[PDB]
């Protein structure tokens, strides 16, 4: 594999789309690689990690409990609800909803949680409170990943998303238990985690949340590193490419391969 930046460029050439990428030390925030890092990209399902950061902040403040059971109706369900559709009779706890949203990609679970934090506007306000002045959520599942060209709704930048994830996971804005919980949800991803592990060399840590959208939109927010340590935050977004899902996945994996082969920078 070529160098990370060289691979990123090749991916844009091959996909005819824009790639946005940040690689950042988790402990310190040292930026190692930045490409279109201040450009906007649709967050897609990656917003679910920030959503559950807001939930945990409410738990820390005593305004929420992960134990609290929410009962909902079939009319509340949106497209793709593999866990929430199973609990119309008995409900789900707030913590179960975060687990379902982040680890199983459950969309109704995300919407239920979004309501508890005051909707897209409430989540955006939370982002402003932690000093993210760029990321914005405007819509609910499933409209939020429409990825219209030039539409600023439901977008982040690689730099903003990396910084925000670092804040939630490490900055002590969340309690120790809450930081640990958010991390464990990412470790437990079942949508892409097991697949990614299957292709990572021995010794590489992965935790992640992935997303997909229209017009080629695809993305991942990840913790990655050798010696089984979450050494770096890696955020990669793609937009405005007509390529197959397989090829978009392969190109992102190829950027990962370049990072792995050329880690010591
Ligand atoms: O010399 C470094 C390594 O080179 C290869 O490893 C390959 C591996 O066989 C391949 O499957 C992977 O694909 C990349 C898979 C990435 C999966 C997604 C990555 C995520 C992670 C965080 C955000 C970016 C995307 O690349 C590495 C590096 O070439 C060798 O197989 C391995 O023995 C060796 O230790
Ligand atoms: C998040 O990125 C979800 C995007 N795609 C879904 C959507 O538009 O709501 C689909 C319904 C596909 O479903 C999934 O990707 C399942 C996992 C969702 C997640 O990662 O949280 S649409 O057909 O693309």
From TrEMBL:
Q: What class of enzyme is it?
A: hydrolase
Identify the InterPro entries for this entry.
Answer: Beta-lactam/transpept-like, Beta-lactam_cat, Beta-lactam_class-A, Beta-lactam_class-A_AS
- Every copy of the Beta-lactamase class A catalytic domain together lies at 24-237
Q: Which domain of life is it from?
A: Bacteria
What's this protein's family per the entry?
Belongs to the class-A beta-lactamase family.
Return the NCBIfam families for the record: bla_class_A, SHV, SHV_LEN_OKP
User: What's the protein called, per UniProt?
Assistant: Beta-lactamase
Source species of the chain: Klebsiella pneumoniae
Gene name tied to this protein: blaSHV-1
